[PDB]
Coordinates of C-alpha atoms and ligand atoms in Angstrom, one line a residue:
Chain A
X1 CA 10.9 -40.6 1.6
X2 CA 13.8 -38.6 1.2
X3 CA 16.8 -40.1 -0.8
X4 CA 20.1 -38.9 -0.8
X5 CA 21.4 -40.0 -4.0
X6 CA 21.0 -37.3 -6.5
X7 CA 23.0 -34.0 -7.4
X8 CA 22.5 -31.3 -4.5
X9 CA 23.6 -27.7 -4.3
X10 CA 24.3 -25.0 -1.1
X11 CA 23.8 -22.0 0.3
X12 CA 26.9 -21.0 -0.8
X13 CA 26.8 -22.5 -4.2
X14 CA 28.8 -25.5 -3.5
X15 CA 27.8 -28.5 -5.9
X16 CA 27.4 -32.1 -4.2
X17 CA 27.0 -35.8 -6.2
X18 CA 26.1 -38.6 -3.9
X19 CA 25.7 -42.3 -5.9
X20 CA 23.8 -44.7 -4.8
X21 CA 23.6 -46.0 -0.8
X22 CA 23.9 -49.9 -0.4
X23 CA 21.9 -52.1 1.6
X24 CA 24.5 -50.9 4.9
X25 CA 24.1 -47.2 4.3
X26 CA 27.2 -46.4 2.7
X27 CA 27.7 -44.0 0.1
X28 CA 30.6 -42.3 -2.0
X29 CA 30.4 -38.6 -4.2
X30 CA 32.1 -35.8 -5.2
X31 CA 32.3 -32.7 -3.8
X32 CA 33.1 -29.3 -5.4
X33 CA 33.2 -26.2 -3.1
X34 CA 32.9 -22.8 -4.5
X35 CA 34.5 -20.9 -1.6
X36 CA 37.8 -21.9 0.3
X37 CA 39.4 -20.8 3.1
X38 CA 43.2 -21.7 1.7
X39 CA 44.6 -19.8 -1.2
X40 CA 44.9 -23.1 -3.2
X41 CA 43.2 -23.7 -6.4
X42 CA 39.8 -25.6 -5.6
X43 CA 39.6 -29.0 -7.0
X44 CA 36.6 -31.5 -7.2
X45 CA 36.8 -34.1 -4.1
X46 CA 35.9 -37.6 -2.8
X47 CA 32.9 -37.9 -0.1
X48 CA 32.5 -41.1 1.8
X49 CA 29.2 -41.6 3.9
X50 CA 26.8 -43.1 5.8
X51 CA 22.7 -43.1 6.3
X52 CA 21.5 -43.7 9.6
X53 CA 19.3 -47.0 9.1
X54 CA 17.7 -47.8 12.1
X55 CA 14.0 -47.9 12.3
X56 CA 14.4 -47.3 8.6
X57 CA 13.3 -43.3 8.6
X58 CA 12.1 -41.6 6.1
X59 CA 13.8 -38.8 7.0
X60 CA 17.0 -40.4 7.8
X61 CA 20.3 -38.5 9.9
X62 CA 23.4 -38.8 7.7
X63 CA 26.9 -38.1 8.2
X64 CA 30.2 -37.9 5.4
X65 CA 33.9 -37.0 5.2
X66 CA 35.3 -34.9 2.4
X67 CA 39.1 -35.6 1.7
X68 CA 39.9 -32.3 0.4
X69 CA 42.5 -33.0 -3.0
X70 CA 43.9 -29.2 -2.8
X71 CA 44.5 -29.1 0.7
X72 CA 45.6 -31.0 4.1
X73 CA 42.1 -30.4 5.6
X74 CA 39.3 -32.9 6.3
X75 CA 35.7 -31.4 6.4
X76 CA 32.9 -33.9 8.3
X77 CA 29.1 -33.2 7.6
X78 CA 26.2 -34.4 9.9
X79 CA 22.7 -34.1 9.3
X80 CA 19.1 -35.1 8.0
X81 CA 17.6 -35.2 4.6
X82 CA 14.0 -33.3 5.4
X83 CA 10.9 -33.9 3.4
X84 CA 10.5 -29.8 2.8
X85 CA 6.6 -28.4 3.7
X86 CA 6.5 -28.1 -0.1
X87 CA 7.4 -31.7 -0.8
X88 CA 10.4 -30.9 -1.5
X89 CA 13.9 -32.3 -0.2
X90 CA 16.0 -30.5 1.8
X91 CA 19.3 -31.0 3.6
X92 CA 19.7 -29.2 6.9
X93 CA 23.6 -30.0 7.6
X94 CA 26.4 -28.7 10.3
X95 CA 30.2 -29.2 9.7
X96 CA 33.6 -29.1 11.1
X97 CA 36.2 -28.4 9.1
X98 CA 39.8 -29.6 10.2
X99 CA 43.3 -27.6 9.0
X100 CA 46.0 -29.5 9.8
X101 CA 48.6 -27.7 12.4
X102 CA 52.4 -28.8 12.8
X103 CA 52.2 -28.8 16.3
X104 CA 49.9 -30.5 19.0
X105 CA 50.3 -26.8 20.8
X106 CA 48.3 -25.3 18.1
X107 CA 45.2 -27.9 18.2
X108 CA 43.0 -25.8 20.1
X109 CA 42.6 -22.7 16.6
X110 CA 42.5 -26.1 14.1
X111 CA 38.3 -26.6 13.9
X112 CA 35.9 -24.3 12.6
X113 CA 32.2 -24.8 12.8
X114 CA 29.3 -23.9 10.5
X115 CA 26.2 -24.7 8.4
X116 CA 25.1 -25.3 5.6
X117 CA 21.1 -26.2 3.8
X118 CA 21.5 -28.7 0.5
X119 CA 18.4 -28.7 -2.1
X120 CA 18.1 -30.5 -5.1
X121 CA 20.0 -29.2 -8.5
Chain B
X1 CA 54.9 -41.2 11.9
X2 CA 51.3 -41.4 13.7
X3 CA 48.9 -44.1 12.3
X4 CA 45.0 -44.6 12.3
X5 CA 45.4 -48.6 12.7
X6 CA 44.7 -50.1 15.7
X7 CA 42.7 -49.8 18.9
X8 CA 42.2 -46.7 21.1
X9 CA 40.2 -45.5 24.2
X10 CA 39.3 -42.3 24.9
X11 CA 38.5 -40.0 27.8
X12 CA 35.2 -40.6 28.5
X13 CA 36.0 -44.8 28.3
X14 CA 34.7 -45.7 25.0
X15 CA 36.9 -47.8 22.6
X16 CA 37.9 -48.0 18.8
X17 CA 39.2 -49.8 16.5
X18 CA 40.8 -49.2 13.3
X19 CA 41.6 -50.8 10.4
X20 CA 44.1 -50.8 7.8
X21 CA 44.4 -47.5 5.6
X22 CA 44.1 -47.9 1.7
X23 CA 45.9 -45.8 -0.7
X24 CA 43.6 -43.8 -1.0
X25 CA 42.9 -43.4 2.7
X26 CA 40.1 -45.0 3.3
X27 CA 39.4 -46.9 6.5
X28 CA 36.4 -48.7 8.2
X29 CA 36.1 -50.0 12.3
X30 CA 33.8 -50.4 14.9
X31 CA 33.3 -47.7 18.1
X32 CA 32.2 -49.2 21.2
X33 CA 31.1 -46.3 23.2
X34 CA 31.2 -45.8 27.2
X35 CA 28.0 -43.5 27.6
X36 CA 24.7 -42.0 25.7
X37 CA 22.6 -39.8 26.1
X38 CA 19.8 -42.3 25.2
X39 CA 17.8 -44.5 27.7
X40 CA 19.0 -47.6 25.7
X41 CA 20.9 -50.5 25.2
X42 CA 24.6 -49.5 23.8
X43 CA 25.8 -51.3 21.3
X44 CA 29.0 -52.1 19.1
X45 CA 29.0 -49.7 16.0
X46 CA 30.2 -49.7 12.3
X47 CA 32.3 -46.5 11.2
X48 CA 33.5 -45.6 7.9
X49 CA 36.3 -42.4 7.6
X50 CA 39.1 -41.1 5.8
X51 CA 42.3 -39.9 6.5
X52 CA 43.9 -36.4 4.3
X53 CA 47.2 -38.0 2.2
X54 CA 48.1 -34.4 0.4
X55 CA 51.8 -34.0 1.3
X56 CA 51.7 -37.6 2.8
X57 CA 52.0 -35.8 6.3
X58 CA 53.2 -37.9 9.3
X59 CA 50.4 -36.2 11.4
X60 CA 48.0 -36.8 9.0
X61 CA 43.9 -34.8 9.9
X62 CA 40.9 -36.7 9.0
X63 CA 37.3 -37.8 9.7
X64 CA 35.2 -40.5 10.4
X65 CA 30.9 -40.9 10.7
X66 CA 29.9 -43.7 13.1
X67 CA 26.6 -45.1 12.3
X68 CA 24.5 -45.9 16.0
X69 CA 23.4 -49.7 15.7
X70 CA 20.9 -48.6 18.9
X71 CA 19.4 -45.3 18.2
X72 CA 18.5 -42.9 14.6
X73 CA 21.3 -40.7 15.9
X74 CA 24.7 -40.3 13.7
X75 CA 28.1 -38.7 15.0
X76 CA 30.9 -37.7 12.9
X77 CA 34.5 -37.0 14.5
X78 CA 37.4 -34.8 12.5
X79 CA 40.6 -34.1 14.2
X80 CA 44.3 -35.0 13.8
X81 CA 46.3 -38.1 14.2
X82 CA 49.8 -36.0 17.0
X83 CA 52.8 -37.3 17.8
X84 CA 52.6 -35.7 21.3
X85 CA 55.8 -34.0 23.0
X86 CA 55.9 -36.7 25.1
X87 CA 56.3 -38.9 22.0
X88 CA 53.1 -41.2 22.3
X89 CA 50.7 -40.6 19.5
X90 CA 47.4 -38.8 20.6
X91 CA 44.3 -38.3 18.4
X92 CA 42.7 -34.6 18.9
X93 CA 39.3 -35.0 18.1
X94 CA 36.1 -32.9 17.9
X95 CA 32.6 -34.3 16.9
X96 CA 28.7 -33.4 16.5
X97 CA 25.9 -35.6 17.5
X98 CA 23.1 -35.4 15.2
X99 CA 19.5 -36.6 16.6
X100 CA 16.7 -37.0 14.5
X101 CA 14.2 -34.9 14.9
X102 CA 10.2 -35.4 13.2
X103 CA 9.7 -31.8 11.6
X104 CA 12.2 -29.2 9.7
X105 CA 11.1 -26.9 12.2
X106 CA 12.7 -28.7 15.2
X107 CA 16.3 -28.8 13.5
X108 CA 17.8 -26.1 15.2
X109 CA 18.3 -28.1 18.7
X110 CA 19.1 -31.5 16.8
X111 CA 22.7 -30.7 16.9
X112 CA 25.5 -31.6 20.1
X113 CA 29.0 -30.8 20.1
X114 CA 32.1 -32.1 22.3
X115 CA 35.5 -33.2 22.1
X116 CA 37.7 -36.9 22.9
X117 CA 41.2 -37.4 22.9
X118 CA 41.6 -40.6 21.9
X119 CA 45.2 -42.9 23.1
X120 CA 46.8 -46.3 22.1
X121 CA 45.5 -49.2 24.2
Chain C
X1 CA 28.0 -24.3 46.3
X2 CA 30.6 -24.0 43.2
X3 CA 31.6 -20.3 43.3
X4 CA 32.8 -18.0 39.8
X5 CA 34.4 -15.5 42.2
X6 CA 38.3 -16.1 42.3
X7 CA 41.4 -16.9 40.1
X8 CA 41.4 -19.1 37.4
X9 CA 44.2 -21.0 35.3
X10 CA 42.9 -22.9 32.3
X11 CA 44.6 -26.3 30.0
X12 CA 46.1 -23.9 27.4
X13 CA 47.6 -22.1 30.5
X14 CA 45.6 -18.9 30.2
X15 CA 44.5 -17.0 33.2
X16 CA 41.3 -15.3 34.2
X17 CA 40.1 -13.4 37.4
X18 CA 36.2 -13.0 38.0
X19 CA 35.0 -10.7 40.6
X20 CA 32.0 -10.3 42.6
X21 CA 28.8 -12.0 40.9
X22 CA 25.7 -9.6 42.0
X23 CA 22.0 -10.6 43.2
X24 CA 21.4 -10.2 39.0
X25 CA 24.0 -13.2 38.2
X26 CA 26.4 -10.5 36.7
X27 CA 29.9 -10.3 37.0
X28 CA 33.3 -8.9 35.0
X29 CA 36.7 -10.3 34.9
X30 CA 39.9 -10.2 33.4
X31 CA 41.2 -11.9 31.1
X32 CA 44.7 -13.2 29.7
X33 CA 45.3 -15.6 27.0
X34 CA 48.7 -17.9 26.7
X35 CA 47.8 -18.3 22.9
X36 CA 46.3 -16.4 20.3
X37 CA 45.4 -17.0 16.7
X38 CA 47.0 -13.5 15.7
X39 CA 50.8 -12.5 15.2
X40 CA 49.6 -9.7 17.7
X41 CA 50.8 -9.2 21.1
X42 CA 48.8 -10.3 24.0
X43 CA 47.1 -7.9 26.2
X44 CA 44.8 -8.8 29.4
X45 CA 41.3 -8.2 28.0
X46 CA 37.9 -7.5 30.3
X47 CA 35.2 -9.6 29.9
X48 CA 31.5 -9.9 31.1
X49 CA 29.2 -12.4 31.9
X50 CA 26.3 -13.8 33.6
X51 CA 25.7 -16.8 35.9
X52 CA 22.0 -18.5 35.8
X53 CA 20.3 -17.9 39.1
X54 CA 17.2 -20.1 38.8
X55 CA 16.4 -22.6 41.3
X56 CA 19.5 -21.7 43.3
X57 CA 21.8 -24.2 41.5
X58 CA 24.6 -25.2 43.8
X59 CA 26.4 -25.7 40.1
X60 CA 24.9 -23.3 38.0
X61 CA 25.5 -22.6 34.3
X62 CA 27.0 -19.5 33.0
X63 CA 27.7 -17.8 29.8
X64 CA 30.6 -14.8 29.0
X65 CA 31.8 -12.8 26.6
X66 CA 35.9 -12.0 26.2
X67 CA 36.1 -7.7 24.1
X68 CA 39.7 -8.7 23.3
X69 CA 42.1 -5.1 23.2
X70 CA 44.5 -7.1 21.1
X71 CA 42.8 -7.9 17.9
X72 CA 38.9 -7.6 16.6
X73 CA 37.6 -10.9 17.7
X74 CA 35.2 -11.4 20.3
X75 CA 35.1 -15.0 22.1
X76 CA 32.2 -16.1 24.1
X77 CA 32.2 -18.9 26.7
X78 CA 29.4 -21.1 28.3
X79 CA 29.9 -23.7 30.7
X80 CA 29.0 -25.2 33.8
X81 CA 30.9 -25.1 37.4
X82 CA 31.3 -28.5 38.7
X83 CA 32.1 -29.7 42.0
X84 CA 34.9 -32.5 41.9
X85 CA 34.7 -35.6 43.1
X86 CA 37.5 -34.2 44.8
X87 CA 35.6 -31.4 46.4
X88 CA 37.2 -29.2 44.3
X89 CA 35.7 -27.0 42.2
X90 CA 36.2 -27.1 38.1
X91 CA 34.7 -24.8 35.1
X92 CA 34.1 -26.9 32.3
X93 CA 33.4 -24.9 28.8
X94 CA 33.2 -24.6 25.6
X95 CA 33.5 -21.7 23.5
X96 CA 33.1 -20.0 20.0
X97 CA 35.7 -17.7 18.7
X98 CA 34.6 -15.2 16.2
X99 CA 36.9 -13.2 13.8
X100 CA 36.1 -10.0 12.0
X101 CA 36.2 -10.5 8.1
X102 CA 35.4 -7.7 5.6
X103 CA 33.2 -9.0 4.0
X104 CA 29.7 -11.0 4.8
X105 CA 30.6 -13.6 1.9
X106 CA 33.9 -14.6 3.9
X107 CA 31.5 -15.5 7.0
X108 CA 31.0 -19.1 7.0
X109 CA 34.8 -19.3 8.0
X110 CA 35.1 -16.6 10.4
X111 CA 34.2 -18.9 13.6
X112 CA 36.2 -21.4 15.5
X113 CA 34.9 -23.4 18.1
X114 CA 36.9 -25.8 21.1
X115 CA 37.0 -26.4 25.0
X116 CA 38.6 -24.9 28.0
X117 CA 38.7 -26.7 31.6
X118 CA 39.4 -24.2 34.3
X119 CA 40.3 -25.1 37.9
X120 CA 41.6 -22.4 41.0
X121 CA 44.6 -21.1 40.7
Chain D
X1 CA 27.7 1.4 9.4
X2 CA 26.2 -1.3 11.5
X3 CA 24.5 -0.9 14.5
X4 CA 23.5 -3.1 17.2
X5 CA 21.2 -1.0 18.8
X6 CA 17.3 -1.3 18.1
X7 CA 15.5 -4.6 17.5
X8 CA 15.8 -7.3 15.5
X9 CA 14.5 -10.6 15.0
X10 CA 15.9 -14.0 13.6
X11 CA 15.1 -16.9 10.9
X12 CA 13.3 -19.1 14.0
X13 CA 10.9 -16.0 14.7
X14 CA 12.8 -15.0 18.0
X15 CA 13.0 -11.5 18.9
X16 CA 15.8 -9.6 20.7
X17 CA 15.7 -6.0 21.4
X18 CA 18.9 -4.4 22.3
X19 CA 19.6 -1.0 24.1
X20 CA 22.2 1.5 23.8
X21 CA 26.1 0.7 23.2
X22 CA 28.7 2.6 26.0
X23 CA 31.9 3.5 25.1
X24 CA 33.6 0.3 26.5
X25 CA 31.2 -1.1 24.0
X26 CA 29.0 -3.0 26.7
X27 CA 25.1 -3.1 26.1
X28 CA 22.1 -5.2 27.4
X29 CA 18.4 -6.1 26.5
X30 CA 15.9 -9.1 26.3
X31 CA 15.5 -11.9 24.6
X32 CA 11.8 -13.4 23.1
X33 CA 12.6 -16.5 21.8
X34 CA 10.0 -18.2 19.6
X35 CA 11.4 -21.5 20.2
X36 CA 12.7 -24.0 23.6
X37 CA 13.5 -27.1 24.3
X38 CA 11.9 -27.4 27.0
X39 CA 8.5 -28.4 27.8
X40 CA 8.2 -24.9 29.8
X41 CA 6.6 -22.1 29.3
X42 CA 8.8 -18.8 27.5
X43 CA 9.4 -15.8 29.5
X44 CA 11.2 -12.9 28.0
X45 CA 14.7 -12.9 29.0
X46 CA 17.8 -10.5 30.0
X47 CA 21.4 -10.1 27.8
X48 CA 24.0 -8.7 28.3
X49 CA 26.9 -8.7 25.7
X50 CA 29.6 -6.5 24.5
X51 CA 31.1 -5.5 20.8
X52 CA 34.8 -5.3 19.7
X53 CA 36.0 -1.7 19.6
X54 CA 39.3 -2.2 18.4
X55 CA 40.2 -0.1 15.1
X56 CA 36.3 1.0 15.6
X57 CA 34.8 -0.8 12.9
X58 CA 31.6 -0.3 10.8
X59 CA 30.7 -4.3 11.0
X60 CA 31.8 -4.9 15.1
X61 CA 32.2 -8.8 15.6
X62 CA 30.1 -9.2 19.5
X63 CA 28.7 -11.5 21.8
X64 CA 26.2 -11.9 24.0
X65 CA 24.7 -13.8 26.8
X66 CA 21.2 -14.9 27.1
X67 CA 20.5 -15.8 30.8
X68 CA 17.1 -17.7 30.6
X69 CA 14.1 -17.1 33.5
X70 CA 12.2 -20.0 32.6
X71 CA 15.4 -22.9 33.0
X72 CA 18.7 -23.2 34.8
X73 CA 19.9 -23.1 31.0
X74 CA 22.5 -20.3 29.6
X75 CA 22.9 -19.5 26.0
X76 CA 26.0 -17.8 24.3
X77 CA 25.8 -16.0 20.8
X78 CA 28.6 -14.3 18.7
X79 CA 29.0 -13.2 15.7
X80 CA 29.4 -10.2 13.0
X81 CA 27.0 -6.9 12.6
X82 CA 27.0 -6.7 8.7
X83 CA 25.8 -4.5 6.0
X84 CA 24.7 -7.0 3.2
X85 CA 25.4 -6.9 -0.2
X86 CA 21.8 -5.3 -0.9
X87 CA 22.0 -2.5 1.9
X88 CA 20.7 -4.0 4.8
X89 CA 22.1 -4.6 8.5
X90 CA 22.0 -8.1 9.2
X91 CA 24.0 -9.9 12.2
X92 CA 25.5 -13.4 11.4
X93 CA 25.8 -15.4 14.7
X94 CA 26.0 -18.7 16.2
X95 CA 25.2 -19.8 19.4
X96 CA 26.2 -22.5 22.4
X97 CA 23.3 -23.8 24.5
X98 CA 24.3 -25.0 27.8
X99 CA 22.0 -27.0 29.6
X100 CA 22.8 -27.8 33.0
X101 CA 23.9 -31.7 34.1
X102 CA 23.5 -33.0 37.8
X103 CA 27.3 -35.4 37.2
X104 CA 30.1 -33.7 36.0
X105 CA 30.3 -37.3 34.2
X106 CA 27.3 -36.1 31.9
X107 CA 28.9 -32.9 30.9
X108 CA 29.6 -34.0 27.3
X109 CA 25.8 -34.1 26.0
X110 CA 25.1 -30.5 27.6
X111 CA 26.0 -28.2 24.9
X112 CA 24.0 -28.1 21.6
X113 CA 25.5 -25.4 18.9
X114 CA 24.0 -23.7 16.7
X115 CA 23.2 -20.8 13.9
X116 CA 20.4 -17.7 13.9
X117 CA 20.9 -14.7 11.8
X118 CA 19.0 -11.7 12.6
X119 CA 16.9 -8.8 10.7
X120 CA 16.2 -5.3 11.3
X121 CA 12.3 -5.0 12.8
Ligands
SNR1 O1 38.4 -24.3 2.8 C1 38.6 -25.1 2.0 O2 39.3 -25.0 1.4 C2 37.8 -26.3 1.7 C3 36.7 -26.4 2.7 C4 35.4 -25.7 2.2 C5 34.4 -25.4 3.3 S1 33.8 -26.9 4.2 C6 32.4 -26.1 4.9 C7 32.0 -25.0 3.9 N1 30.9 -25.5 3.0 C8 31.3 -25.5 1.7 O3 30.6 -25.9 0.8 N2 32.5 -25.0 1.6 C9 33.1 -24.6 2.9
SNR2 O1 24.5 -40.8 22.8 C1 24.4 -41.9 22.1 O2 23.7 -42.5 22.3 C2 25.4 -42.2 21.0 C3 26.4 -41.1 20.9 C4 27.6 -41.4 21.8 C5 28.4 -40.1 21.9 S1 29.2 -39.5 20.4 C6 30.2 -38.2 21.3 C7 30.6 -38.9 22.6 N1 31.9 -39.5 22.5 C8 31.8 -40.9 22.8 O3 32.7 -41.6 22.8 N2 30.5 -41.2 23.1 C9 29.6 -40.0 23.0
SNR3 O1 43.3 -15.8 19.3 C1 43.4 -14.8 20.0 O2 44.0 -14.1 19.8 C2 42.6 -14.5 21.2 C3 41.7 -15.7 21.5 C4 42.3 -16.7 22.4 C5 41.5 -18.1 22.3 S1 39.8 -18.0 22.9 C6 39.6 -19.8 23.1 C7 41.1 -20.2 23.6 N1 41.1 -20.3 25.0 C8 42.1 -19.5 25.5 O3 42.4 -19.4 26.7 N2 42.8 -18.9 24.5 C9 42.2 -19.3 23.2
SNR4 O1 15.6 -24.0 24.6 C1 15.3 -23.2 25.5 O2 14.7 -23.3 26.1 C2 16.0 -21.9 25.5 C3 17.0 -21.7 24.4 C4 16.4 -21.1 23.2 C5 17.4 -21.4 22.0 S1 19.0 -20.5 22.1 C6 19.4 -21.0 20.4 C7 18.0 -20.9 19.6 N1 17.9 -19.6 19.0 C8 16.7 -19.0 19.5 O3 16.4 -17.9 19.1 N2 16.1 -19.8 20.4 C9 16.8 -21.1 20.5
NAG5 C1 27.5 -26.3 -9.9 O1 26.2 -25.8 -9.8 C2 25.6 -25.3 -11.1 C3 25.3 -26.5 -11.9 O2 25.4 -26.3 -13.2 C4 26.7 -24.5 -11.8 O3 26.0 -23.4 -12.4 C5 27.8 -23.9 -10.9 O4 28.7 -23.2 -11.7 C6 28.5 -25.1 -10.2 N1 29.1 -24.6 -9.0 C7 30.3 -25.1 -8.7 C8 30.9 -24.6 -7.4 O5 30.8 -26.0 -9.4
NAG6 C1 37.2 -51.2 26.1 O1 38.5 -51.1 26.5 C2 39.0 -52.3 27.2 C3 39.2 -53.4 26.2 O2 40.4 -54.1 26.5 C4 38.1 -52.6 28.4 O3 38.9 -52.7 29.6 C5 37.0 -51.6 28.6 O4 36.1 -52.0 29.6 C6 36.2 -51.4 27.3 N1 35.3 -50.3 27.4 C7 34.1 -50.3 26.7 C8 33.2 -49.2 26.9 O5 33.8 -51.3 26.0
NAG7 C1 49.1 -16.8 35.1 O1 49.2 -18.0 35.8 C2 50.3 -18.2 36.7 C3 50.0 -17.4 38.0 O2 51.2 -16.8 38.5 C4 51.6 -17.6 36.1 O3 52.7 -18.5 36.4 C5 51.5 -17.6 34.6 O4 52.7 -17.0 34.0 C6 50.3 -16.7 34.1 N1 49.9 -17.1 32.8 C7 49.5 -16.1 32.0 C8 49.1 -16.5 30.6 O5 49.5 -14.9 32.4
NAG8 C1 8.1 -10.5 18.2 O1 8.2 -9.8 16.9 C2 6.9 -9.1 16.6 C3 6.9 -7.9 17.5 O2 6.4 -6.8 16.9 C4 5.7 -10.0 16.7 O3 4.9 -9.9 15.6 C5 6.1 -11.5 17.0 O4 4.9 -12.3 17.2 C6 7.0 -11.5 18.2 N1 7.5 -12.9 18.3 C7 7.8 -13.4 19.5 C8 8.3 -14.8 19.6 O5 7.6 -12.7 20.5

């Protein structure tokens, strides 16, 4: 089985805590990023989840919402905790990261997209 | 000032609804959607988000993960909550689809992106 | 059949001209944008593309790429043409804008993704 | 300086060999991908793509697309020829899929997104 609960860190050295997932699915963390795109000092933030339980998997898909504290940005992570070659777990995740725009005109330039692989810390 | 509360439709038919914010933006609902690419039997599904409150903007970004009652798949949305020239709020939304896949090495076609623009029913 | 040859005007308002696809599925085009990214003037840009020619598809898929002379980005393009319900024809896409940065560590932020829907003009 | 010309393969064991780069920036080449989602069998395919010339850089941002022989599928990729921090060329890209749909009304499940970054054969 791969679990998410546990301290993870990225590819780009970004630090993730995920507590424990209820009986529904649900979890909460902390996320600290070590690369922004703002020009904002980068403060820890709040993650709220959920683990896909249907068929109960093993290898479960997974999705969470960062509520950036240093910025008006939302960043949403979807993926699915592997269960590595080696044993080991691994996190294969894709985002979309949301900056907020003042007008609806200037939606279309407001989501970038990208990856990113989580393993244990 | 555009709010997250309530029920909304989007362009493809499906329908949300949208509970009450907390003060620290947290929200939770259920997505009913119109289509999938699955061969099975849609059903209503939980979804648990946030919304951004630095600034306490009026067109506030955020991001939700719905959890598929009928399938292993997840899908997080992120976008922003408009006021729209027309004066009718409007929420701008892009999202990824994540399937499960069985092996790490079929990860790289798990992934589907789109958009929805969700209105007010 | 669902034809790239002609004049095209997109939702943002940009406008694009496609001319002659060969016996290859290749074709060039022009390109001009009602919105950019940049504080940069707007300039019509070329772009290049191909159109997939198996099994004769009466709406094929297609794929190009926008060499903007305004800035260093490069935007590619992938879609499908459609034929309405209407009997009119529609280019439905979805691209990924890529910027330069100067360095490989500022990459994970240097790509935006979104849609276009492109009908005659 | 980075070059696109040569060939080069990718973390998914792909291999893309690309020919020489005109003055308008415009190139072509083929395509061995290692992986499909298809249940067909691979044939080596034709690209064609162009690179940003503007301000002539050393790390061009490009794009390119892959029109596949063996489905009525087209794939977009763009991204960035870098020289890594230890010396190397390498080209950070991601990539559209397009898969075609028979109902314009299935158009939001046909495009899966993705990542591959390429090394110097
Ligand atoms: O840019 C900011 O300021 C905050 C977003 C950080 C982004 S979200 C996707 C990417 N992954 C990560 O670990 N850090 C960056
Ligand atoms: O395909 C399935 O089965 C479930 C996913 C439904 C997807 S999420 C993106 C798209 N938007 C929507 O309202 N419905 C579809
Ligand atoms: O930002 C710029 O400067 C040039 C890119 C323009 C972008 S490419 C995707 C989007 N579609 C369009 O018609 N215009 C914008
Ligand atoms: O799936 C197919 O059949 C053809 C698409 C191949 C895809 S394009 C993105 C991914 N990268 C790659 O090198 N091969 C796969
Ligand atoms: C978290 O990861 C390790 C854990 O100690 C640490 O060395 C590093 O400085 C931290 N990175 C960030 C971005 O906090
Ligand atoms: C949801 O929106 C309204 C509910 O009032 C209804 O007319 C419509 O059929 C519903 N659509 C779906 C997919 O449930
Ligand atoms: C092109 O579209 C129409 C065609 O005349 C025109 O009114 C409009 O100004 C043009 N838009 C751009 C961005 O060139
Ligand atoms: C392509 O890369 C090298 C060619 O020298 C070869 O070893 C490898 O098997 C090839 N891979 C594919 C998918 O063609």
């Amino acid at each position: 089985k791969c679990s998410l609960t546990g301290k993870w860190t990225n590819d780009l050295g970004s630090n993730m805590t995920i507590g424990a997932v209820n009986s529904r699915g649900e979890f909460t963390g902390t996320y600290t990023t070590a690369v922004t795109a703002t020009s904002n000092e980068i403060k820890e933030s709040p993650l709220h989840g959920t683990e896909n339980t249907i068929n109960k998997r093993t290898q479960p898909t997974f999705g969470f919402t960062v509520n950036w504290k240093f910025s008006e940005s939302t960043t949403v992570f979807t993926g699915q905790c592997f269960i590595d070659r080696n044993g080991k777990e691994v996190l294969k995740t894709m985002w979309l990261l949301r900056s907020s725009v003042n007008d609806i005109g200037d939606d279309w330039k407001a989501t970038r997209v990208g990856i990113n692989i989580f393993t244990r810390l």
